[PDB]
Amino acid sequence: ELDQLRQEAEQLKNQIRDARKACADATLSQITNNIDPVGRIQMRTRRTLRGHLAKIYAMHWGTDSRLLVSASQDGKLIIWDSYTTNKVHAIPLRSSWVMTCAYAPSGNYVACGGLDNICSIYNLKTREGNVRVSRELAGHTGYLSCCRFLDDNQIVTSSGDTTCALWDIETGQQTTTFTGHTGDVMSLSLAPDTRLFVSGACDASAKLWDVREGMCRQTFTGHESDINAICFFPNGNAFATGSDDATCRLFDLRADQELMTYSHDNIICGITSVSFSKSGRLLLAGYDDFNCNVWDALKADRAGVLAGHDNRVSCLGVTDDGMAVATGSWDSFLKIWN
Amino acid sequence: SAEDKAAVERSKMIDRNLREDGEKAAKEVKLLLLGAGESGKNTIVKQMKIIGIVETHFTFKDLYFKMFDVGAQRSERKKWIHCFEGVTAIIFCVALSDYDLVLAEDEEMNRMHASMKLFDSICNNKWFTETSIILFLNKKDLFEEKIKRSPLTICYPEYTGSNTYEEAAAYIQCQFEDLNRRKDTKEIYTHFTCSTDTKNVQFVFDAVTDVIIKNNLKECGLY
Amino acid sequence: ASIAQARKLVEQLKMEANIDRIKVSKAAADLMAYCEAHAKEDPLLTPVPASENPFRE
Amino acid sequence: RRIFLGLGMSISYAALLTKTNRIYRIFEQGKRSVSAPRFISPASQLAITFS
Numbered sequence: 001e002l003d004q005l006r007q008e009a010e011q012l013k014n015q016i017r018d019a020r021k022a023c024a025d026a027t028l029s030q031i032t033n034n035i036d037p038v039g040r041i042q043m044r045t046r047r048t049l050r051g052h053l054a055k056i057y058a059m060h061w062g063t064d065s066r067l068l069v070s071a072s073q074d075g076k077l078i079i080w081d082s083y084t085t086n087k088v089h090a091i092p093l094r095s096s097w098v099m100t101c102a103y104a105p106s107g108n109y110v111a112c113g114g115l116d117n118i119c120s121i122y123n124l125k126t127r128e129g130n131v132r133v134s135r136e137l138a139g140h141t142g143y144l145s146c147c148r149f150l151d152d153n154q155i156v157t158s159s160g161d162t163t164c165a166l167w168d169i170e171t172g173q174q175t176t177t178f179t180g181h182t183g184d185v186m187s188l189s190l191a192p193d194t195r196l197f198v199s200g201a202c203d204a205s206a207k208l209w210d211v212r213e214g215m216c217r218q219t220f221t222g223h224e225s226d227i228n229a230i231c232f233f234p235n236g237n238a239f240a241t242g243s244d245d246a247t248c249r250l251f252d253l254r255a256d257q258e259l260m261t262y263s264h265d266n267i268i269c270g271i272t273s274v275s276f277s278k279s280g281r282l283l284l285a286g287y288d289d290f291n292c293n294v295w296d297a298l299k300a301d302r303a304g305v306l307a308g309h310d311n312r313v314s315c316l317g318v319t320d321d322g323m324a325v326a327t328g329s330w331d332s333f334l335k336i337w338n
Numbered sequence: 339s340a341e342d343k344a345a346v347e348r349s350k351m352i353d354r355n356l357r358e359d360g361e362k363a364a365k366e367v368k369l370l371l372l373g374a375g376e377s378g379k380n381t382i383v384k385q386m387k388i389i390g391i392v393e394t395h396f397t398f399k400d401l402y403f404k405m406f407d408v409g410a411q412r413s414e415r416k417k418w419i420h421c422f423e424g425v426t427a428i429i430f431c432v433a434l435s436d437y438d439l440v441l442a443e444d445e446e447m448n449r450m451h452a453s454m455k456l457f458d459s460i461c462n463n464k465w466f467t468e469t470s471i472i473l474f475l476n477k478k479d480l481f482e483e484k485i486k487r488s489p490l491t492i493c494y495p496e497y498t499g500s501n502t503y504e505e506a507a508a509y510i511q512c513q514f515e516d517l518n519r520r521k522d523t524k525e526i527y528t529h530f531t532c533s534t535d536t537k538n539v540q541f542v543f544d545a546v547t548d549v550i551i552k553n554n555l556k557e558c559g560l561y
Numbered sequence: 562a563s564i565a566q567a568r569k570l571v572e573q574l575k576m577e578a579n580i581d582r583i584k585v586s587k588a589a590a591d592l593m594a595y596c597e598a599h600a601k602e603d604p605l606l607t608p609v610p611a612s613e614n615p616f617r618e
Numbered sequence: 619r620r621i622f623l624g625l626g627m628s629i630s631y632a633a634l635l636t637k638t639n640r641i642y643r644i645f646e647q648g649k650r651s652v653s654a655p656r657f658i659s660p661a662s663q664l665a666i667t668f669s
Contacts, residue, residue: 115390
């Protein structure tokens with residue numbers, strides 16, 4: 001009986017593969033061959049932030065494109081004024097072990113996901129000037145790999161436990177749970193419309209979930225190893241995904257297939273963070289090669305190299321207006337490029 | 339920029355607090371704690387405390403210790419253990435009584451070999467090269483009570499000793515320390531403990547002190 | 562069992578793959594159109610002088 | 619005649635003292651904190667000898 005269900009299941013995955021094959025008239029390269037090259041990019045460092053002592057692990061840009069939140073392996077969350085390199089706030093984190101941080105779209109709140117399985121929300125605009133701890137979100141039975149603000153009242157959190165969650169902040173209840181994944185959800189990204197999001201797990205499969213019902217609208221495969229970073233394309237019809245096989249892939253949502261592959265023989269180590277630039281033409285991927293790479297989003301060709309850190313790049317973030325890209329690395333410095 | 343001078347003042351005060359707290363934390367020693375389920379880590383952690391991630395704080399003649407209990411995480415260890423790279427001690431707790439036990443919900447994989455496999459995965463992981471492992475062969479008494487009848491050959495078929503306690507526990511220590519391949523750089527501080535007031539806190543203090551001094555003598559190239 | 566859930570999902574996913582069975586050429590055209598149309602507001606693609614970039618000013 | 623003796627009879631003991639201070643500081647902080655005591659690096663420590 002179980003083998004019978006296994007035969008139906010893979011009877012339909014076969015049909016799904018056939019459907020994905022029916023759409024593939026030509027790859028992206030065959031149509032984008034006529035596009036003019038972007039040109040060699042000489043992006044240089046403009047700011048270096050001498051902040052945390054030990055290790056930077058996550059970094060997120062505020063919607064103002066000026067305030068910038070950074071998180072450390074042990075210690076505090078530092079909120080920078082990126083224009084003048086000031087330290088607007090220092091948050092004395094309860095749990096030292098951090099894996100993700102998020103800045104609210106309104107700017108009133110921040111969140112440190114933490115590796116202690118407890119998402120900690122911090123209210124910034126407090127009467128007594130000190131950053132207070134608002135209702136902590138507990139009950140995810142796994143380390144919070146990534147957390148993202150839907151809005152001031154709704155957050156989406158990815159856990160080492162395969163279940164992604166959506167929390168209502170006033171009451172702290174896990175108001176929605178997405179369980180379609182089989183592996184540990186390493187990365188998560190929210191579409192610009194915020195109507196739905198995507199997440200990638202260790203099973204080399206990305207899944208596109210919607211926040212209102214929770215049903216898994218689509219699943220994408222193709223990667224040979226764990227998916228560690230996903231970034232939505234700015235328009236929202238596509239999303240790029242990095243993996244330990246050192247290959248960025250640009251999946252499409254209204255389509256359902258690979259559609260692109262970003263790999264070169266010179267780079268072996270796996271990707272760690274992806275962030276489409278504004279207008280989507282450039283994809284910036286950090287590597288364990290002690291380095292960062294600027295890929296053409298339309299041509300499978302390297303546009304430039306940053307190469308300005310002494311330790312592994314923790315994360316990348318492009319401002320909402322695209323003015324500059326902050327690269328936070330395992331070396332304690334966070335460097336802003338443009 | 340008449341008001342931004344106050345912003346720079348806030349930045350300098352925050353930087354000062356950052357540096358003081360950072361030096362205070364870099365003053366302290368960070369010790370990992372890991373092992374198989376029911377390895378007896380509870381008794382060990384209770385002894386040092388008497389003197390998600392569970393952080394336990396204890397002091398033994400200054401040199402304030404922060405201990406991190408990790409067993410609580412049933413998840414992918416490969417993407418999690420890339421943290422804890424700055425720990426100056428990795429307390430590995432394994433119970434010698436595991437040699438006799440066939441299963442841990444794991445297809446009749448002997449708990450001892452499951453522990454050795456985890457030790458192999460964690461000791462030789464390329465994140466940890468300078469971090470030293472402190473090996474607690476826990477429940478020495480229950481092992482001494484079991485070995486008197488049930489031969490270690492049920493766990494280690496190549497063992498040919500007389501099943502006497504010393505010749506058995508010395509074999510387990512020898513095997514665990516030979517399981518460490520990169521012995522040129524790493525050190526294994528094997529110790530035998532049980533549910534009594536041992537020197538296990540004193541032994542952790544001594545091993546941590548020695549590893550600290552070894553690290554500092556590497557910093558200046560004296561060693 | 563859980564497998565009945567997995568299949569109940571995968572069949573639905575097939576139905577979405579049939580509605581989303583738009584040709585890859587259309588997706589390529591849409592991606593190219595966005596990249597071309599929203600160009601010139603890419604500070605990373607085309608650098609801007611010191612008069613407007615906030616990180617030199 | 620003055621400079622040769624004044625350097626030879628003093629840089630020896632400055633090097634001795636600096637070496638012993640290195641060993642002593644490293645060991646007598648090791649029992650107290652993990653941080654490496656400042657001014658022990660093999661290169662910059664020579665400056666203590668020149669001072």
